Write an enzyme that holds these catalytic residues in place. Structure first.
Site, mmCIF file in Angstrom:
data_model
loop_
_atom_site.group_PDB
_atom_site.id
_atom_site.type_symbol
_atom_site.label_atom_id
_atom_site.label_comp_id
_atom_site.label_asym_id
_atom_site.label_seq_id
_atom_site.Cartn_x
_atom_site.Cartn_y
_atom_site.Cartn_z
ATOM 1 N N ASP A 1 -5.899 4.741 -0.840
ATOM 2 C CA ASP A 1 -4.535 4.484 -1.228
ATOM 3 C C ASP A 1 -4.449 3.168 -2.024
ATOM 4 O OD1 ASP A 1 -4.970 2.647 0.589
ATOM 5 O OD2 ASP A 1 -3.091 2.816 1.731
ATOM 6 N N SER B 1 0.795 -1.230 0.000
ATOM 7 C CA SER B 1 0.000 0.000 0.000
ATOM 8 C C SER B 1 0.823 1.273 0.000
ATOM 9 C CB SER B 1 -0.951 -0.076 1.222
ATOM 10 O OG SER B 1 -0.908 1.010 2.171
ATOM 11 N N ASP C 1 -7.121 0.491 1.952
ATOM 12 C CA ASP C 1 -7.134 0.335 3.402
ATOM 13 C C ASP C 1 -7.095 1.659 4.159
ATOM 14 O OD1 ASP C 1 -3.872 0.515 3.053
ATOM 15 O OD2 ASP C 1 -4.126 0.287 5.196
ATOM 16 N N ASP D 1 -4.003 -0.049 -1.715
ATOM 17 C CA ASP D 1 -4.721 -1.269 -1.396
ATOM 18 C C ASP D 1 -6.134 -1.036 -0.874
ATOM 19 O OD1 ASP D 1 -4.134 -0.072 0.855
ATOM 20 O OD2 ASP D 1 -3.164 -1.744 1.944
#
Lengths: 445, 445
Positions: B239, B99, B243, B241
């Protein structure tokens, strides 16, 4: 050291043919093919073997760690891999399979740009690297890394091509198919159904464990019974990777690769397409194949067993057709390795165009009977010369005078020698073989 | 030895995080999770990083060489991996990503059955094996081998779930999205458009090289300008990923994770859903977050940096909500790790239900100014005690009396100490920090 044999790399998947090794393969082999451009273009293809996926992922990991753009194809016959690797001008092509072997086995096979097995030079270097104990090849990072665009539509291009080489739709024909539960499962049945043929299937139902499991070219008796059952006109039995073909006639009988070569080359000669009207084939072919070839004024070239040799021959002298008794026939007008479905379409073209049934067409070529007798002996390697044996053979060779053939070779596996005889009939076989066998038991026991 | 850090395994793909190692991971880690049933069920998921594929294939090769049935998911946020690994009762779940880092980097992350990072016991053994120099784990062959059924439909299940937690469609709202060119690219835009919101996109156009490239939560200024440009109501910046989440108000300003925690926990308390009306958060949070929390009668728990700790806390005491200033908020009613899109839907629920604009809602919580001054010094580690320093601080701490906060720590990277001050205004920061900085330069220089 020695990973690349006849048919590429083979082993029982995971135990011998580990994913570690399928990694080293794609990594190094993708280096070797990388010398052209910084971004080669391998494409990769596989059969239904469950180990398929495991190897495909480790191989693609290798390829990507050296910059190769990679094109998964999914499940597709080896033919289609070669056809496409040529038609798409790709640096190489890969086939994960081990045709006709049992499911636990698998293998990696390579094709060059031209559609031909890799040069022995290249394989040489691939092995050179695979025994160095330092992976000193480059490790691109960030944007240099491999790229991977699936192309599962590949299949229907190689379909689209086979479909053009059928001299007219096949209306009015009932064909049974047995696809070994392999790569040809989905390709065949679309093809002959899109060519307007009454298709009845079997072995078309893969689950990644049932490949070549009492089906397919190697085990055609299921198909033998199915043809009679569905009272079809003929049965086609491809094998695991779609590279062989064995037919079966409406009568239920088997129609091996000599008879398919006969049948097809004969039809081709009737269209002027057989080049110099000759046919390449191997030692293994049946005398009566050569006889019926002469009878139809088709000449022939013999080569040693294995299609690296049968293709070596058609290459130099520009021959159109060549084959093996296995069912592995090459039509070089159209593709660069053995192509089960091509064979099958050429066979159907014959059938359609002549309106004869497959039994009739395959009866032109009459097989000679064979006979094997194996005699146990004390010292099986001293039969290379003998004050009796060596003589007996020669006499019987000349006594036969072109109508027969003899072959005596010692075994490896065991302590005995194998006498074997082609003759025009079963009782000549019996006579001739008994003669030789007698003068052998005279020595050994 | 030490492969599993905070955020799993990380490295620059190929150079440090080699596919060899992503193989050893899935092989050994799939052993460790194999102790239950002979046929575990890992599922695996990845972001758009180009190294994604290379790692995914080597990892799946590992997993398959020890019997694990494996479910590729394709591109999906880490949230969705955890949500699904729970909802499908799968032994584990895997996320290939890193990420918000730049594209060249990547990483492997693991989730257990419950949706939580693996037990430190398990990771322990995974590492135990990864340093033995003999791969003595079983090598199933034939039918024992791993199995692999893709499940790219996973995505739209985790969509189907997020879509139920929206308290009504979002008609009448203009939202801009910046998805970092990452896993959330296709998920977000379907979601808010299927929830009837005017969506204007950006960073939604991944090519496997552009992840987190002047977009996404870490680089929100592009989105800042885009909101004003498209005159939307708010901007969401996930972002790489999916998360984290950072918002942006119609005025263009940034709305960090403290302000999103404030905004949402406050709305939740107004539905009786905030559990014991408390909120977990980390040291890093801004004093004025705690102030406005008190003002709305929401209590709070502080924990050390990192969501292993912020989740350790909500677990025992059964807390509903917890977060970090990064944008990483956990709503445990709904999922077991930080969930960018969940955050975003909770934020929109707030907006819709209150009819206020995001600027108004985020103004309730007033941030305190910070100030950093770094002074070069001779021996930065002897500041732990001092006949002046240690005193000055304490006095200023009490002089502040709850309205401020001070933090002085020496650096590692360099030879200097970092003085830092929260205060109600910029000029108190200036006063207080200057005081401390003076009594430091007295010693060092």
């Amino acid at each position: 050291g020695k990973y690349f044999g006849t048919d590429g790399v083979r082993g029982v998947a995971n135990s011998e043919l580990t994913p570690e090794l399928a990694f080293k393969v794609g990594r190094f082999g993708g280096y070797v093919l990388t010398k052209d451009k910084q971004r080669p273009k391998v494409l990769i293809g596989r059969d239904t073997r469950i180990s398929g996926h495991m190897l495909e992922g480790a191989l693609v990991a290798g390829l990507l760690s050296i910059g190769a753009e990679v094109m998964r194809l999914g499940v597709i016959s080896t033919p289609g891999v070669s056809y496409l690797t040529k038609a798409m001008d790709a640096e190489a092509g890969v086939m994960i399979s081990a045709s006709h072997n049992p499911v636990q086995d698998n293998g990696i096979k390579f094709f060059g740009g031209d559609g031909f097995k890799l040069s022995d030079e290249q394989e040489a270097e691939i092995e050179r690297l695979m025994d160095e104990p330092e992976d000193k090849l480059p490790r691109p990072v960030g944007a240099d890394l491999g790229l991977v665009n699936d192309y599962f539509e590949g299949g229907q291009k190689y379909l689209q091509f086979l479909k053009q080489t059928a001299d007219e739709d096949f209306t009015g024909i009932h064909v049974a198919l047995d696809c070994a539960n392999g790569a040809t499962s989905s390709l065949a049945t679309h093809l002959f159904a899109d060519l307007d043929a009454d298709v009845s299937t079997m072995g078309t139902s893969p689950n990644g464990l049932n490949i070549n499991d009492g089906v397919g070219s190697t085990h055609p008796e299921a198909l033998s019974a199915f043809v009679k059952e569905k009272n079809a006109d003929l049965g086609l039995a491809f094998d695991g990777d779609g590279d062989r073909l064995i037919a079966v006639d409406e009568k239920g009988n088997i129609v091996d690769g000599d008879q398919i070569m006969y049948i097809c080359s004969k039809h081709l000669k009737s269209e002027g397409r057989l080049k110099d009207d000759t046919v390449v084939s191997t030692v293994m072919s049946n005398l009566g194949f050569y006889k019926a070839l002469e009878k139809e004024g088709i000449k022939s070239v013999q080569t040693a067993v294995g299609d690296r040799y049968v293709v070596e021959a058609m290459k130099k002298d520009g021959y159109n057709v060549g084959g093996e008794q296995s069912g592995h026939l090459i039509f070089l007008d159209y593709n660069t390795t053995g192509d089960g479905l091509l064979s099958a379409i050429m066979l159907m073209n014959t059938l359609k165009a002549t309106g004869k049934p497959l039994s009739e067409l395959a009866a032109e070529m009459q097989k000679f009977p064979q006979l094997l007798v194996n005699v146990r002996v004390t010292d099986k390697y001293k039969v290379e010369e003998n004050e009796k044996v060596k003589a007996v053979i020669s006499e019987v060779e000349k006594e036969m005078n072109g109508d027969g053939r003899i072959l005596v070779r010692p075994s490896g596996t065991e302590p005995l020698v194998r006498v074997m005889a082609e003759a025009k009939t079963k009782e000549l076989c019996d006579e001739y073989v008994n003669r030789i066998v007698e003068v052998v038991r005279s020595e050994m026991g």
